[PDB]
From a paper:
Proliferating cell nuclear antigen (PCNA) is an essential cofactor for DNA replication and repair, recruiting multiple proteins to their sites of action. The proliferating cell nuclear antigen (PCNA) has a central role during DNA replication, acting to recruit enzymes to the DNA replication fork, and to modify enzymatic activity and processivity. PCNA also regulates entry into S-phase via interactions with the cell cycle regulator p21 and the pre-replication complex component Cdt1. These PCNA partners all utilise a similar peptide motif to associate with PCNA, the PCNA-interacting-protein (PIP) box.
We examined the effects of the PCNAS228I mutation that causes PCNA-associated DNA repair disorder (PARD). Diffraction quality crystals in P43212 space group grew after 10 days at 20 °C, set up in a 1:1 protein:precipitant volume ratio with well buffer containing 2 M (NH4)2SO4 and 0.1 M NaOAc pH 4.5. Data up to 2.27 Å was collected on the i03 beamline at the Diamond Light Source, Didcot, UK. The overall structure of PCNA is retained by PCNAS228I, it is a recognisable toroidal trimer, with pseudo-6 fold symmetry and a central hole through which double-stranded DNA will fit. There is no evidence of trimer destabilisation, as the monomer–monomer interface appears unperturbed when compared to published structures of PCNAWT. The structure is of sufficient resolution that the electron density of the isoleucine substitution can be identified. The larger isoleucine side chain has a steric clash with Tyr133 in the standard position, forcing a 90° rotation of the sidechain of Tyr133, which in turn repositions a significant proportion of the IDCL (amino acids Gly127 to Asp120). The S228I change has very little effect on the overall structure and whilst the total rmsd between our S228I structure and wild type structure is 0.6 Å, the local rmsd averaged over the three IDCL regions (residues 120–130) is 1.9 Å. Many of the residues of PCNA that are most affected by the S228I change coincide with those IDCL residues sitting at the interface between PCNA and PIP box containing proteins, such as p21 and Fen1. It thus appears that this dramatic structural reorganisation of the IDCL, resulting from the single amino acid change in the PCNAS228I protein is likely to prevent this binding surface from operating correctly.
Numbering used by the authors:
A (entry chain C): 1 to 185, 193 to 255
B (entry chain A): 1 to 185, 193 to 258
C (entry chain B): 1 to 185, 193 to 256
Write the structure that this text describes.
Amino acid sequence: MFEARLVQGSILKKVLEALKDLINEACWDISSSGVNLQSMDSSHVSLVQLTLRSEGFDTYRCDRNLAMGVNLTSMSKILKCAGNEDIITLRAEDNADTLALVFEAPNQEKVSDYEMKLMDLDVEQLGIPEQEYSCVVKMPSGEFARICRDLSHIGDAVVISCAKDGVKFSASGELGNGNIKLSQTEAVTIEMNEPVQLTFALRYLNFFTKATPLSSTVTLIMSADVPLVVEYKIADMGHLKYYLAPKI
Amino acid sequence: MFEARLVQGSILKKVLEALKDLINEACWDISSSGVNLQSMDSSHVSLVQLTLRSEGFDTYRCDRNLAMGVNLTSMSKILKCAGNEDIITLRAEDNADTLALVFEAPNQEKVSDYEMKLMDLDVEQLGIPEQEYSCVVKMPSGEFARICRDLSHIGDAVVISCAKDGVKFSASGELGNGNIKLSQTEAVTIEMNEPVQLTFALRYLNFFTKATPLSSTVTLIMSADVPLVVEYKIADMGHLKYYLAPKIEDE
Amino acid sequence: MFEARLVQGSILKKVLEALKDLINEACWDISSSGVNLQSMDSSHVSLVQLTLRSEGFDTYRCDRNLAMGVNLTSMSKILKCAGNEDIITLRAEDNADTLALVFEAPNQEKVSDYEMKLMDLDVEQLGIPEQEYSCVVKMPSGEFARICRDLSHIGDAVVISCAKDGVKFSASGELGNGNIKLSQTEAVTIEMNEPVQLTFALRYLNFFTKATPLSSTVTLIMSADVPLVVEYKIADMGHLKYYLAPKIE
């Protein structure tokens, strides 16, 4: 048996909202420590990793580890049927085949029960090398989303430069060019251990900022020659992290 | 002759909003007791009936019965020109041809006058079978609209099964299946005099829920072998009722 | 060297929003008295004129007159990158080629710098139409926008009839007709020096009401024989005026 009860169900809604634009299907790895999901995006450019610890659920039981193949488009459509204050319960039998989602309204007079067919996917885990923290930028998540949206009107790629005084986002295109300079202060903190200057495709960052509702801050972790990490904390539960390799 | 003054003009706006998605044209029957309208949908699947009693109007005068053929799209375009707090007056001369709508703002500095051409429509007598109240469900109108929208993501048809303790709405499709169970308590009341289980096309129920702004509650009246009634009360005036035949089973 | 600092940058955002539906490219004429723009719209029916006087800017310096050819679509995209409370500075070197727009948040922790390529345009050469103030109506801008939208559901043109006590807006089409009567009082004032009854295309007036955010009042200046003026004041700075001919003449 697998059964997990989450009183703040909107978390799951926001999680699915943050993944379906990027991934069509993926494996949810369920174990006694909680829920882990790792997947390349459907264009095989970026990597996504989700962690939800068992301690963040109001009830959690996992008799046997399972790897559930899920069409995220379908699961997101089902989670649109939950109200933002619903209690959400996931349940799956040993040897999978279907996953049940139960939404209990807080009045207690209405209960919704959805059953989703599970898919047959063979995906193997990619390893994540140890992180080098050359620059770490923590900033309001809405400000980062607006930065990416603004510069994608100028160009298709952003140059992120992190040096002692601050962090700069630059783009260049047919209409001209732009840059946005942030200095350390809705607080902005900058840990610069060695300067970095890297180029990234704005299309993928604009996908990553769909996780903005999960947290009021985002963390950017940059180092030379390794993927940028864009990370959102899922309070008292885990994280959603996106990895993106720099250009050229 | 005909003249009716309605101080809460937004009612008419909401009425037209609730009809234009289902029917294009309809005959407004005007008499001294008030306004009646009945029409099948443009696909002749569902039926709509509207009553606005003369007593719900602040002024009401009708010297001779009229059957006004109205393009509901045009009437809706005109009523979009009224503000939500406008006083709305309808006026028509004996033997019709046009309907006048006057919108008076509450400031009193602005008055709008619209004249709408009427049209010639074929009217087919339709009878309503007396209602059998096998199951009656009263619930918040917003909750019913959300139930219908949620399950139309799962499938195109909803099975409504009504039993002693409660009512269940079920759907099935690709993606899988879902059901939503309501128990008696934003109050939900369930009168089950005999069990009913019927299937209905979610597309038409989704048309019916465009009436949600007229009332905070909706009533579902279900019986075996007779069309479902989905009813919204128009407080202190009348009602909008929608009728939908169940889907026919296979074999 | 041209440099202009505007502490209420949202003015510039609203201006570009009020022009971009109507004009793709136009010349911004910069002089020591300020910023002037005039252009026919992209369909060559209506005329648009913008004035922003130097005194309205908190800083203003113009060493030499410039004619900056600007793609207004590009400029509006850049100005969407400014927040509504940003301080905006425009800057251009002598002999143009690019225009710099600097957006400073008021906390001072964020600064955005955009460089926009200018273009060489062959301007049409236009006079500003003659004025006669036969009738002048001042009214809330939102009410005027609502009148134009509502009647464009009835017909393609509005007949504006002006009398001493009030003004009437009428339209007619295949579904029927409508009129909206305003009397002099969110006040509407009417200076009627000669009676007027004039017809104008609602499609173009509906373009003009995109300037509604710049002002809570709009002024209609009507005459037989010269173009209607629809005017929005840009408070303590200038105006945006739209012109439409009453007749084909």
